[PDB]
């Protein structure tokens, strides 16, 4: 149930001594290393042509956050604050009140993307599938405050990426 | 005018030579540097873009702050950034370098490297993927492409 | 004459690649960019302190073995003489004396580094 | 390593930091088609270990940088609190997947590589042979995967499914209270240490009955290994101390917390 | 019309250095299962132009503690001695046909070390000091065989004339009677030119950059292009020594094409050794060129003195 | 002697090859028939001018023209 | 000989891009000249290609449009230009275009 | 270059993880463990999971 | 694939073909359509200076044969 | 897997191993990106009787 790595004694007949002396004087293992490197020279490299070719992803992938809607236009977020109660970095800040038809909705739904740890506890804690962490990962900004999303930016992320987020939830939701 | 055309083409030449020869520096801090090594890995391959590491700050062009900036290393970060010759750029990788991240309310963490150095590109993620980091690097190249150095010299 | 012209050309466009390296870009000089590099933290002491050589006996014996290729170097020409067995004996005497010196430097552990 | 990060990204949604293995099991079941791709990876990974070992193990320049470098005696290894390969390079037959086994490591058969000289080179060979044995354990785990659920069915600890959270009342209450307050851990303290690939990685967890930890000390192997760096570096040079810091595989996030 | 001959020598062997940077990065990439540059030009063919423009529009950064005179003189002397070691190389005709061109190559090798050496001293830094005295430890290791190997190979030539070395190898290559000298000279030129496994001066992992760790862009360019001019000149010199080709006095371009492709194959061989080996510790460097190569080099020096006498095959000195 | 020779060929084959090549370079020109021909070629190479002689009357071994049959000849070099 | 087949595949890659002009177009915009089965084209002009004989990562690509939302994207191709319905197919979140 | 004393100053990445764990729940304290040994992620998850 | 290193090498090949080829042509332009005279030894220089003296145009490469004598 | 048999044979000789049998670049042998919808099993406490939580 254990093995001795490097407990080999070399052979001391004249054949193996002459073989190791030819290995020393004529550099056999160095030519082995050169041969393996030359073998990789004649291969197809694994370099995908970004930005035209993309690394493969799954429908579980956790990227940019987005607030989803029902298939009628109504937003899903009913202000229940589980996503900011389970958020391990306190990136989500929610302020709510009954809106003009008496419905439980949010007035403030902020996600600080520069506190966010992209672990997806908010999308698995949301009882109505409102907050999700969608597929976008190419959203680098040139200023810090552009990565402090309010409710408007997250709803626009949902309206932007809904035709993909709905399909990824349709692909994965039986595992959840 | 002719001189505006000449300084426009020379701006295009120097912006081409600076965005197509970015030399980052071997400088990571935390988990993002593993992914930054994956951006150097043969799948995404920074070196096809001219992006290749130089360990010294004197011969580096961009500093990718890849990881968590604590209080104990913030003067080391500032002196490393200071020892880069101009033009030098800063790409902030990951949430801890962007805004403190998962250690934001900590006693020992600088809440974003933009308290220390001027930051050009903020790359979001924990970690951002190597593809997202390469997206941020190509956005930095697009930011260098639209610089107007000699035009603003010609107009001032 | 051609050697001086060639050396002047090489030195000239090696120093005209430096005078267009210092005067062409834009400088922003301040007294932290020109600080000594010590991987981010401030250097402890000077780099003009004594940097103790471990390979010092090999460094001295290099000065006694580098003279040998001021002595063994006429051997392509010394083979062109008409007293040739004497030349061959003296040549093998010189390489043998170099070899006996190297053997003595081995056996007293002179080629090893200190500490 | 990129392909295994694709395996993480498929099973959990993130390439590096998954938050997948949770108290109670794992978060989410394996997606369909994952294990067949793990088989297609593990079928070919041995040739990669072979060509790494071709480039380095019998190479004379690799040996002259690592054979007489960083020798650790056994008693000074136990005294310095070393663990993992740092013990196993020195010949200390100790592996927590054998001696103090956890979840199903007593149900998988593998070997433990034992070094002979305590140097950087035997620790290199121990890490290469642990890659070999990890391929062996992945073969045994792909063959012996059982059907069933992936969380503990104590639904006051692990959350219910979303198909039953939206239908049952108790499952909705348990979802609510586990994602806001969380489960209450009973009072007491444990020290649970596993064989991480760097050595004995421990958690000393102190709970006071609440839903939050009272204390959580993180024992890292790299802390004690980097402590022993100062003995291991004696009589060597800079180009050897870089090999000693290599063979003490340090990740400083666990060294510094 | 000799100044035009000097320019048509030294400007294409700057363009060859420039595209050697691209060949290095791409052959190094395909040996590392990746690609090299292919974005900047059509399959990377304009990447070195971007690197050459970039280093001379970046701020030069003369340091505060640097002794400035030697700090500026070190890359100037680097690129000067890198260019001027190409002039006795027969291509099949050298620029300056020297009767003792081999000793010119050897002495200007010995003077090129002071570029690295004064750069490490003048840039008053600790890593630069380590990179300079590791160049001392490397040069006292390779110079103690670089002259005896090059002596033993010219005992079949008759002189120190590099142009006569074409006439010497008109029948057989001089690697066939002297392949131990050839395989030892090749490692001595690896250790001469600070290339891997004998980097040891610009140590990326021990040091940060070694001697040129303070040199920002512009002066750093004249160490890097100097080093690559040294490796192309050194493979051309190795090719002239051991793989000397057919020379037609009426068709010189045949010899030019032939030694060009041979020296390109040896340049790819340098890139392929740099892509495959760990780096020596710089004492094991010294215990190689003194304890292993030097005894056998003395033995082969005895053999190559006695053997033209032994077979009545002493070559002519004229 | 084969035991010590195999021991030094097992530990230090570089030095065994060194002493073998050096011993051949020592002893082998003393056992070769061609070492005389080296000296004969070197003293048969005309660097200087063959300064002629005033013919006193009795020098029968010295020619009066280079194509005369008396004098030193290099037919041994042409054949070898 | 099979090097002749290699030269024939190179010349039919020159043929498959509409000649030398389109060959140089996809060369200088893509740094990649291999042909592909045209899977689709969105409402912006981004063309989406398969080649299942390539390896996993190279088997699906996009040639971006030259004008998207008023910006000249001839040289400034961008990863964020892909619409979300093609972002599953291109990133291999599904087999289905 | 012979090393006479090594003093590794650490804490340049001391984030104060295990004080932040005290103010967060067990599920919220789980992703701190991914970032300790950030090349051995699910092993740290497994160790924390076995402790809890 | 790997043959994409073959353009750059080829460019480097031309950048090693240009010097030596040129100097051969330069040795055939300054020296009357022939090779450059090699004077390693002072006798060769004496013959070369004799050629420069007997050319009549103060150029060593302009040769004079039996047409110069009667 | 698109390499010529000359380059394939040179590559197999240089590495000393059979490389087309074990390729590190993935092709159509891998799993499909679109999978059928699963039916995940339930645990032992998903019963309607003899399922008192205190037991
Ligand atoms: C050695 C000297 C060079 C000989 C030519 C060579 O090696 O061609 C590659 C050719 C194919 O190599 P491979 O790696 O097996 O490629 C398989 C791919 O499926 C074949 O690749 P593919 O299926 O993608 O085919 C398309 C490919 C076709 O590739 C070519 O046409 C190769 C370039 C030929 C010129 O064309 C391109 O990709 C366009 C390349 C454009 C730039 C080429 C620059 C070449 C240097 C000259 C400047 O190599 C051989 O057939 C073996 C060497 C033959 C040597 C003969 C004696 C000399
Ligand atoms: C050997 C290979 C490399 C050869 C050298 C490179 C080839 C190209 C040479 C010309 C490149 C363009 C000019 C140099 C780069 C200037 C960069 C810069 O910052 O310029 C801003 C500067 C002006 O900067 P500024 O005035 O805006 O100052 C900003 C900085 N503060 C406010 C802090 C002081 O412009 C120049 O210096 C102009 C340089 C000459 C422009 C062209 C003239 C005609 C040439 C034909
Ligand atoms: C110039 C054209 C090409 C030439 C060939 C070179 C191309 C191939 C290069 C491959 C990559 C090498 C990269 C650098 C590697 C550095 C390491 C290295 O080489 O170390 C040297 C190694 C060192 O070996 P080592 O380091 O293992 O030695 C251990 C030493 N002790 C025991 C003291 C610890 O080998 C040598 O030194 C051998 C030198 C060459 C030997 C040539 C001998 C020829 C045969 C002579 C005759 C033999 C029979 C006796 C007489 C019989 C008479 C009848
Ligand atoms: C009086 C009028 C003239 C005034 C003086 C100007 C003289 C000419 C100066 C050089 C040319 C100026 C224009 C420079 C390029 C401007 C256009 C440009 O930037 O095009 C972008 C394009 C690449 O697009 P990109 O976005 O990078 O691609 C993404 C990846 N698909 O880029 C490309 O496709 C490649 C761009 C190549 C740039 C030119 C080639 C390099 C420069 C050569 C000359 C200078 C150096 C000479 C040698 C010095 C020593 C080595
Ligand atoms: C007469 C011929 C000409 C001789 C003079 C010319 C020599 C040319 C080559 C130059 C050599 C110069 C340097 C030689 C040094 C030899 C001394 C030496 O190194 O001894 C030590 C060595 C064992 O090494 P060690 O002490 O353990 O070192 C530890 C670190 N490596 O000890 C050894 O390895 C043992 C060395 C002695 C035994 C060698 C046997 C070789 C036999 C070959 C066949 C016979 C050749 C004819 C010569 C007689 C040999 C007995
Ligand atoms: C402060 C730091 C330094 C800063 C300034 C740096 C300047 C450049 C330094 C590097 C160059 C040093 C040159 C040293 C002299 C080299 C002489 C030489 O090249 O000799 C080789 C060659 C031998 O060939 P030969 O056998 O004579 O053939 C002709 C007869 N048939 O000879 C020939 O072919 C003969 C051709 C004519 C030779 C003329 C005599 C030499 C002129 C020397 C100039 C000054 C050298 C300064 C050295 C500075 C060293 C740092
Ligand atoms: C011994 C041999 C040594 C060889 C050394 C050189 C090797 C490489 C040779 C060149 C290789 C190809 C270079 C391609 C350059 C870019 C071409 C291109 O497409 O540029 C486009 C760019 C932007 O134009 P845009 O208006 O955006 O185009 C929209 C199109 N509908 O527009 C531009 O970039 C503006 C035009 C710039 C043209 C620069 C061309 C390259 C110059 C290289 C310098 C050396 C040339 C050779 C000298 C010696 C031989 C005579
Ligand atoms: C040359 C190949 C790419 C190397 C890129 C290194 C960039 C800096 C990353 C920092 C780093 C270094 C140096 C490093 O060596 C290392 O060890 C594995 C890390 O992880 C703990 C690092 O984070
Ligand atoms: C006209 C002369 C142009 C010289 C250009 C010099 C700058 C190019 C350096 C590229 C480079 C090369 C070749 C290189 O060898 C290298 O090592 C892997 C690098 O990364 C550390 C590089 O950046
Ligand atoms: S992914 Fe995690 S850190 Fe980010 S907002 Fe959601 S719960 Fe918070
Ligand atoms: S958990 Fe969902 S519904 Fe509740 S507050 Fe958060 S996003 Fe809104
Ligand atoms: S942003 Fe997160 S994943 Fe990234 S380095 Fe920081 S702690 Fe690690």
Pick from B62, B77, B70: which is nearest to B120 by CA? B62
Contacts of residue E310 in chain F, CB cutoff 8 Å?
28-29, 32, 34-35, 38
CA E15 to ligand 9 center in whole angstroms: 13
Where helices occur in chain E by DSSP H, the ranges are 2-10, 12-30, 47-54, 68-83, 101-122, 126-154, 164-168, 179-192, 221-242, 252-274, 282-289, 293-310
Nearest residue to D206 via CA among D194, D196, D217: D217
B68 Cα–ligand 12 center, Å: 6
End-to-end, the C-alpha distance of chain C in Å comes to 52
D191 Cα to chain A: minimum distance (Å): 24
Phi, psi of A150 (to 5 degrees): -90, -170
Closest CA to E88 of E237, E255, E232: E237
Angle at E177 (CA atoms; ends E176, E179), nearest 5 degrees: 65
Going by their DSSP bridges, the two strands D112-114 and G37-41 should be labelled as unpaired
Triad E235, E238, E244: Cα angle to 5°? 115
Distance from CA of B6 to the nearest CA of D (A): 46
Structure tokens at B105: 């309310």
CA of G85 to the centre of ligand 7 (A): 37
Closest-CA residue to E63 (of E71, E75, E54): E71
Q: Give the number of C-alpha atoms closer than 13 A to the C-alpha of residue A97, restricted to the C-beta side.
A: 4
Q: CA angle, C6 as apex, C4 and C9 as ends, to 5°?
A: 105
Chain B: residue whose CA lies nearest to G58: B43
β-strand pairing of B121-123 with D21-22: unpaired
Q: Which two tokens stand for residue C102?
A: 């190297």
Contacts of J50 (CB under 8 A, 6+ apart): none
Question: Which residue, among B134, E23, E39, has the nearest Cα to G31 in the 3D structure?
Answer: E39
Of E186, A175, A176, nearest to D31 by C-alpha is A175
Contact of B137 with B22, CB cutoff 8 Å: yes
A90-112 in b/e burial notation, b at 16+ Cβ within 10 A? Answer: ebbebebeeeeeeeebbeebbbb
What DSSP assignment string belongs to A92-116? EEEEEEE-TTS-EEEEEEEEETTT-
| B35 CB within 8 Å of a chain D CB | yes
Q: Which two tokens stand for residue E259?
A: 């030694």
Do the Cβ atoms of E5 and I16 come within 8 Å? Answer: no
Ligand 10 pocket, mutate which of A67, A86, A87 (most atoms under 8 A from CB): A87
Q: Is C2 in the pocket of ligand 5 (CB under 6 A)?
A: no
| Dihedral of alpha carbons B7, B8, B13, B17, sign | positive
The alpha carbon dihedral of E238, E243, E249, E255 has a sign of negative
> What's the token pair of residue B42?
């043969």
Instruction: Please give the residue range of the domain that contains residue I15.
Output: 1-70
* Cross-chain CB nearest to J38 (options A36, A42, A175): A175
Whether H52 and D185 lie within 8 Å, measured CB to CB: yes
The residue whose CA has the least distance to atom 24 of ligand 7 is: G75
Judge whether E263 and I16 are in contact, CB under 8 Å. Answer: yes
* Residues 6 or more apart whose Cβ sits within 8 Å of residue A163: G83, G84, G85
Cβ–ligand 5 distance for F3 under 6 Å, the answer no
For E77, the token pair is 């002397």
Give the separation between CA E124 and CA E127, rounded to whole angstroms.
Answer: 9
In the block, residue with structure tokens 């490796």: E231
Please provide the DSSP assignment of H7-49 as one string: -----TT---HHHHTTTS-HHHHTHHHHTTSTTSHHHHHHHHH
With an 8 Å Cβ cutoff, the interface of chain A facing chain J consists of: 32, 35-36, 38-39, 42-44, 46, 56, 171, 174-175
Question: How was this model experimentally determined?
Answer: cryo-EM
Distance CA G78, CA I13 (A): 36
Distance CA A115, CA A122 (A): 14
If we measure between CA atoms, which residue out of E190, E193, E192, E150 comes closest to residue E174?
Answer: E150
- Rounded CA separation C10/E111 (Å): 15
Q: How far is G88 from J33, CA to CA, in rounded Å?
A: 10
Domain map of chain C by residue range? Answer: 1-115
Residue nearest atom 11 of ligand 4, based on CA coordinates: B13
Tokens of D185: 């851990």
- How far apart are the C-alpha atoms of D8 and D12, rounded to whole Å? 6
Instruction: Pull the structure tokens for residue A135.
Output: 């597929």
CB contact under 8 A, A12 and F14: no
Ligand 1 site, residue I22, Cβ cutoff 6 A: no
Q: Which residues line ligand 8 (CB under 6 A)?
A: B 26-28, 33-34, 36-37, 40, 53; D 251
Beta-bridged to residue A96, according to DSSP, are: A106
- Using a CB–CB cutoff of 8 Å, tell me whether C54 touches chain H: yes
Q: What angle do helix axes B2-19 and B130-145 make, rounded to 10 degrees?
A: 160
**d(CA I33, nearest CA chain E) in Å:** 11
- Closest Cα to atom 29 of ligand 7: G74
User: D188-196 and D199-207: which strand pairing?
Assistant: antiparallel
Q: Which of D17, D98, D180 is opposite residue A1, by nearest beta carbon?
A: D98
> Would you tell me which residues 23-42 of chain G have a C-beta closer than 8 angstroms to some C-beta of chain J?
none
Cβ atoms of residues B68 and B116 within 8 Å? no
Question: Could you write out the three-class secondary structure of chain G?
Answer: CCHHHHHHHHHHHHHHCCCHHHHHHHHHHHCCCCCCEEEEECCCCCEEEECCCCCCCCCEEEECCCEECCEECCCCCCHHHCCCCCHHHHCCCCCCC
Distances (CA, A) of G94 to A9, G48, J29: 55, 15, 16
Place of tokens 């054998």: D98
* CA separation for the pair J44, J55 (Å, rounded): 13
With beta carbons under 8 A apart, name residues in chain G contacting E42: 27-28
Check if the beta carbon of residue G64 is closer than 8 Å to that of residue G46: yes
From ligand 10's centre to the CA of A117, what distance in Å? Answer: 6
Between CA H46 and CA H33 the distance in angstroms is 9
Q: How many CB atoms lie within 10 A of CB D40?
A: 16
DSSP E66: S
Query: What sign does the dihedral D11-D17-D19-D25 (CA atoms) show?
Result: positive
DSSP structural state of residue C27: -
I69/E contact by beta carbon, under 8 A = no
For residue F42, give the nearest of C81, C92, C99 by CB distance: C81
Task: Give the number of other CB atoms < 10 A from CB of residue C90.
Answer: 10
Ligand 7 centroid distance, CA of B52 (Å): 23
Q: Out of E178, E183, E237, E295, give the residue to mutate to test ligand 3, the one with the largest number of ligand atoms within 8 Å of its CB.
A: E183
Cis before H36 (ω within 30): no
CB contact under 8 A, G91 and A54: yes
Distance from C-alpha of C60 to C-alpha of A92, rounded to nearest angstrom: 71
Whether residue B41 contacts residue B48, with contact meaning beta carbons closer than 8 Å, is answered with no
CB contact under 8 A, J10 and A42: yes
CB contact under 8 A, E273 and A34: yes
CA–CA separation, D207 and D184 (whole Å): 9
- CA dist., res. G18 & res. G11, Å (int): 12
Q: How far is CA E59 from CA C24, C37, E55, J45, in A?
A: 9, 16, 8, 71
Pocket of ligand 7 (CB under 6 A): E 15, 41-42, 45-46; G 28, 74-75; I 11, 14-15
Cβ contacts of C40 on chain B, cutoff 8 Å: 73, 75-77, 79-80
- Alpha carbons E241 and E255: distance in angstroms, whole number: 14
CB E148 within 8 A of CB C72: yes
Q: Please classify residue B126 by burial: count the beta carbons closer than 10 Å to its beta carbon, then call 0-12 exposed, 13-18 middle and 19+ buried.
A: buried
Total tally of structural domains belonging to chain I: 1
For the Cβ of A111 lying below 6 angstroms from any atom of ligand 11, the answer is no
CA-wise closest residue to A32 among A21, A44, A23: A23
Ligand 11 in contact with A125 (CB < 6 A)?
A: yes
> Smallest CA–CA separation between A48 and chain J, in Å?
12
The Cα–Cα gap between D186 and D208 comes to 7
Nearest to residue B103, comparing CAs of D201, A91, D212, D217?
A91
**CA dihedral in degrees (D67, D73, D76, D77; nearest 10)?**
70
| CB–CB contact E217 B85 (8 Å) | yes
Task: Count Cβ atoms below 10 Å from residue I2 Cβ, excluding itself.
Answer: 19
CA distance, residue B108 to nearest chain H CA (Å): 6
**Mutation for A interface: J5, J9, J14, most A CBs within 10 A:** J14
- Residue A30 CB neighbour total at 10 angstroms: 18
Q: How distant, in Å, are the alpha carbons of D42, E24, E191, E223 from that of E32?
A: 22, 12, 23, 26
Q: What is the largest CA-CA distance in chain B?
A: 58
Give, using CA atoms, the residue closest to atom 6 of ligand 2: E53
Length of chain H: 52
Task: Tell me how far apart the alpha carbons of residues E161 and D213 are, in angstroms, rounded to a whole number.
Answer: 82
Q: Do A37 and E30 touch (CB under 8 A)?
A: no
Put simply, whether E26 touches B (Cβ < 8 Å) is no
Give residue D104 CA to ligand 1 midpoint distance, Å: 52
Q: How far apart are the C-alpha atoms of E131 and E117, rounded to whole Å?
A: 8
Q: DSSP string covering E240-254, please?
A: HHHS-----SS-HHH
> Cβ of D71: how many Cβ atoms within 10 Å?
16
Query: The dihedral of CA E262, E264, E270, E272: what is its sign?
Result: negative
Query: How big is the C-H interface in CB pairs under 8 Å?
Result: 3
Q: Nearest CA to CA, how far is C3 from chain B (Å)?
A: 35
d(CA C92, CA E303) in angstroms, rounded, equals 9
Helix (H) or strand (E) holding F24: helix F13-27
N- to C-terminal Cα separation, chain H: 48
Find out whether G73 and G66 touch, Cβ atoms under 8 Å: yes
Q: What letter would DSSP give residue B85?
A: P
Resolution of the solved structure (Å): 3.1
Spatial distance between the Cα atoms of B39 and B129, rounded to a whole number of angstroms: 8
The tokens for A119 are 């672990």
Q: Rounded distance, CA I7 to CA A116, Å?
A: 47
Please choose, from the candidates B59, B1, B65, B74, the residue with its C-alpha nearest in 3D space to the C-alpha of residue B27.
B65
Give the separation between CA I53 and CA I65, rounded to whole angstroms.
Answer: 14
Task: In whole angstroms, give the CA distance from residue B124 to residue B136.
Answer: 9
In angstroms, the Cα distances linking B126 to A5, A96, A118, D89, E11 are 39, 28, 6, 35, 50
In SS3 terms, chain D reads as: CHHHHHHHHHHCCCCCCCCCEECCEECCCCCCCHHHHHHHHHHHHHHHHHHHHHHHCCCHHHHHHHCCCCCCCHHHHHHCCCCCHHHHCCCCCCCCCCCCCCCCHHHCCCCEEECCCCCHHHHHHHHHHHHHHHHHHHHHHHHCCCCCCCECCCCCCCCCCHHHHCCCHHHHHHHHHHHHCCCCCCCEEEEEEEEECCEEEEEEEEECCCCCEEEEEEECHHHHHHHHHHHHCCCCEHHHHHHHHHHCCCCHHHHHC
- Give me ligand 10 centre to Cα D255, in Å: 26
Instruction: For residue E296, give every residue at least 6 positions away whose Cβ sits within 8 Å of its Cβ, in sequence order, or none.
Output: E180, E184, F14, F17, F18, F21
Task: Give A10's contacts (C-beta < 8 A, 6+ positions apart).
Answer: A16, A20
Judged by a CB distance cut-off of 8 A, whether residue I1 touches chain A is: yes
Give dist(CA B91, CA B28) in Å, integer. Answer: 12
Counting one residue from chain C and one from chain E, the pairs whose CB atoms sit within 8 A come to 182
Bridge partners, residue D113, by sequence: A3
Does E35 contact chain I (CB < 8 Å)?
yes
**Residue partners of F52: CB distance under 8 A and separation at least 6:** none
Give, as one character, the DSSP assignment of residue A156: H
Q: Rounded to an integer, what distance in angstroms lies between the CA atom of residue B60 and that of residue D82?
A: 38
End-to-end CA distance of chain E: 29
Backbone angles phi, psi at E285, to 5 degrees: -50, -50
Asked whether D28 and A175 are in contact (CB, 8 A), the reply is yes
Structure tokens at B63: 């500093």
């Amino acid at each position: 149930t254990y093995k001795y790595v490097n407990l080999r004694e070399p052979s001391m007949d004249m054949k193996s001594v002459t073989d190791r002396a030819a290995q020393t004087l004529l550099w056999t293992e160095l030519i082995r290393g050169l041969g393996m490197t030359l073998s990789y020279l004649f291969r197809e490299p694994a370099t995908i042509n970004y930005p035209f070719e993309k690394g493969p992803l799954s429908p579980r992938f956790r990227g940019e956050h987005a607030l989803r809607r029902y298939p009628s236009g109504e937003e899903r977020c009913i202000a229940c604050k589980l996503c900011e109660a389970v958020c391990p970095a306190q990136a989500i800040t929610i302020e709510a009140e009954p809106r003009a038809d008496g419905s439980r909705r949010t007035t403030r739904y902020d996600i600080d993307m520069t506190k966010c740890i992209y672990c997806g506890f908010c999308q698995e804690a949301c009882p109505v599938d409102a907050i999700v962490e969608g597929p976008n990962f190419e959203f680098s900004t040139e200023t810090h405050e552009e990565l402090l999303y309010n409710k408007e930016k997250l709803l626009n992320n949902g309206d932007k990426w809904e035709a993909e987020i709905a399909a990824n939830i349709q692909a994965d939701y039986l595992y959840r | 005018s002719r001189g505006e055309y000449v300084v426009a083409k020379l701006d295009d030449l120097i912006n081409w030579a600076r965005r197509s020869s970015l030399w980052p520096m071997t400088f990571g801090l935390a988990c993002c540097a593993v992914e930054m090594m994956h951006m150097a890995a043969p799948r995404y391959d920074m070196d096809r873009f001219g992006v290749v590491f130089r360990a010294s700050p004197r011969q580096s062009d961009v500093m990718i702050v890849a990881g968590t900036l604590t209080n104990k290393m913030a003067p080391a970060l500032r002196k490393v950034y200071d020892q880069m010759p101009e033009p030098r750029y800063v790409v902030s990788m990951g949430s801890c370098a962007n805004g403190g991240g998962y250690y934001h309310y900590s006693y020992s963490v600088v809440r974003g490297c933009d308290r220390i150095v001027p930051v050009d590109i903020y790359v979001p993620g924990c970690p951002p993927t190597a593809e997202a980091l390469l997206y941020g690097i190509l956005q930095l190249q697009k930011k260098i492409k639209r610089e107007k150095r000699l035009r603003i010299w010609y107009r001032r | 004459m051609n050697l001086m012209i060639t050396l002047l050309t090489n030195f000239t466009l090696a120093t005209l690649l430096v005078t267009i390296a210092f005067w062409l870009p834009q400088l922003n000089v301040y007294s932290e960019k020109t600080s000594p590099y010590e991987c981010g933290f401030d250097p402890m002491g000077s780099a003009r302190l004594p940097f103790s050589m471990k390979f010092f006996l090999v460094a001295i014996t290099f000065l006694l073995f580098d003279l040998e290729i001021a002595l063994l170097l006429p051997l392509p020409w010394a083979s062109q003489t008409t007293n040739l067995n004497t030349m061959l004996t003296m040549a093998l005497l010189l390489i043998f004396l170099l070899a006996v010196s190297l053997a003595y430097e081995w056996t007293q552990k002179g080629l090893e580094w200190t500490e | 390593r990129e392909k295994m990060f694709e395996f993480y990204e498929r099973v959990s949604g993130a390439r590096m930091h998954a938050a997948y293995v949770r108290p109670g099991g794992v978060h989410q079941d394996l997606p369909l088609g994952l294990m067949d791709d793990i088989y297609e990876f593990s079928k070919n990974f041995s040739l990669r270990i072979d060509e790494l070992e071709e480039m380095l193990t019998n190479n004379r320049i690799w040996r002259n940088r690592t054979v007489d470098i960083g020798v650790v005696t056994a008693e000074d290894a136990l005294n310095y609190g070393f663990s993992g390969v740092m013990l196993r390079g020195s010949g200390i037959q100790w592996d927590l997947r054998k001696t103090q086994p956890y979840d199903v490591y007593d149900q998988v058969e593998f070997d433990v590589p034992i070094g002979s000289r305590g140097d950087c080179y035997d620790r290199y060979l121990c890490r290469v042979e642990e890659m070999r044995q990890s391929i062996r354990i992945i073969s045994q785990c792909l063959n012996k995967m059982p059907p069933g659920e992936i969380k503990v069915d104590d639904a006051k600890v692990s959350p219910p499914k979303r198909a039953e959270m939206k239908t049952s009342m108790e499952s909705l209450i348990h979802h609510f209270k586990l994602y806001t307050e969380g489960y209450q851990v009973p009072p007491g303290a444990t020290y649970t240490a596993i064989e991480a690939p760097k050595g004995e990685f421990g958690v000393y967890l102190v709970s006071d009955g609440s839903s939050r930890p009272y204390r959580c000390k993180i024992k890292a192997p790299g802390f004690a290994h980097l402590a022993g760096l100062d003995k291991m570096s004696k009589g060597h040079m800079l180009a050897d101390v870089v090999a000693i810091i290599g063979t003490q595989d340090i990740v400083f996030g666990e060294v510094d917390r | 019309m000799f100044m035009i001959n000097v320019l048509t020598l030294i400007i294409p062997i700057l363009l060859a250095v420039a595209f050697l940077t691209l060949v290095e990065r791409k052959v190094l990439g395909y040996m590392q299962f990746r690609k090299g540059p292919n974005v900047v030009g059509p399959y990377g063919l304009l990447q070195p132009i971007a690197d050459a423009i970039k280093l001379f529009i970046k701020e030069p950064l003369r340091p505060a503690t640097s002794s400035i005179s030697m700090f500026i003189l070190a890359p100037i002397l680097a690129l000067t001695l890198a260019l001027t070691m190409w002039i006795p190389l027969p291509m099949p005709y050298p620029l300056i046909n020297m009767n003792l061109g081999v000793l010119f190559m050897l002495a200007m090798s010995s003077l090129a070390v002071y570029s690295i050496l004064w750069s490490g001293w003048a840039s008053n830094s600790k890593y630069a000091l380590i990179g300079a005295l590791r160049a001392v430890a490397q040069t006292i290791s390779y110079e103690v065989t670089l002259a005896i190997i090059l002596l033993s190979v010219l005992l079949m030539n008759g002189s120190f004339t590099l142009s006569t070395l074409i006439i010497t190898q008109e029948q057989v290559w001089l690697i066939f009677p002297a392949w131990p000298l050839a395989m030892m000279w090749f490692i001595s030129t690896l250790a001469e030119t600070n290339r891997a496994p004998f980097d040891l001066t610009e140590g990326e992992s021990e040091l940060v950059s070694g001697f040129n760790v303070e040199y920002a862009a512009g002066p750093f360019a004249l160490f890097f292009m100097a080093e690559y001019a040294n490796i192309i000149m050194m493979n051309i010199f190795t090719t002239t020594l051991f793989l000397g080709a057919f020379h037609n006095p009426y068709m010189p371009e045949l010899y030019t094409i032939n030694f060009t492709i041979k020296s390109l194959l040896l340049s790819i061989t340098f890139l392929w050794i740099r892509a495959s080996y760990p780096r020596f510790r710089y004492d094991q460097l010294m215990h190689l060129l003194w304890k292993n190569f030097l005894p056998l080099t003395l033995a082969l020096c005895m053999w190559h003195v006695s053997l033209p006498i032994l077979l009545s095959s002493i070559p002519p000195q004229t | 002697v084969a035991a010590f020779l195999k021991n030094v060929w097992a530990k230090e084959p570089v030095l065994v090859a060194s002493f073998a090549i050096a011993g051949l370079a020592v002893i082998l020109p003393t056992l070769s028939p061609y070492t005389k021909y080296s000296l004969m070629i070197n003293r048969a190479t005309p660097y200087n001018y063959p300064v002629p002689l005033r013919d006193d009357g009795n020098m029968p071994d010295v020619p009066s023209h280079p194509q005369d049959p008396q004098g030193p000849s290099l037919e041994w070099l042409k054949r070898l | 000989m099979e090097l002749l087949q290699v030269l024939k595949r190179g010349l039919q890659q020159v043929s498959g891009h509409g000649g030398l002009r389109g060959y140089l177009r996809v060369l200088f915009r893509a740094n990649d000249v291999r042909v592909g089965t045209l899977v689709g084209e969105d409402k912006y002009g981004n063309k989406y290609y398969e080649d299942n004989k390539q390896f996993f990562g190279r088997h699906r690509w996009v040639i971006y449009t030259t004008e998207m939302n008023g910006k000249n994207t001839f040289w400034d191709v961008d990863g964020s230009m892909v619409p979300p319905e093609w972002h599953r197919w291109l990133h291999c979140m599904t087999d289905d275009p | 270059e012979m090393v006479r004393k090594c003093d590794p100053h650490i804490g340049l990445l001391h984030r104060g993880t295990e004080k932040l764990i005290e103010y967060k729940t067990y599920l919220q304290a789980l992703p701190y463990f991914d970032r300790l040994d950030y090349v051995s992620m699910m092993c740290n998850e497994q160790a924390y999971s076995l402790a809890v | 694939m790997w043959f994409e290193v073959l353009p750059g090498i080829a460019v480097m090949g031309v950048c090693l073909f240009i010097p030596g080829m040129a100097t051969a042509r330069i040795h055939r332009f300054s020296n009357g359509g022939r090779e450059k005279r090699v004077a390693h030894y002072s006798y060769q220089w004496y013959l070369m200076e004799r050629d420069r003296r007997v050319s009549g145009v103060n150029r060593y490469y302009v040769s004079k044969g039996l047409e110069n004598i009667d | 897997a698109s390499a010529t048999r000359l380059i394939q044979g040179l590559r197999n000789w240089a590495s000393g191993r059979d490389l087309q049998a074990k390729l590190q670049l993935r092709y159509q042998e891998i799993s499909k990106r679109t999978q059928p919808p699963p039916k995940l099993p339930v645990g032992p406490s998903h019963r309607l009787s003899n399922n008192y939580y205190c037991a």
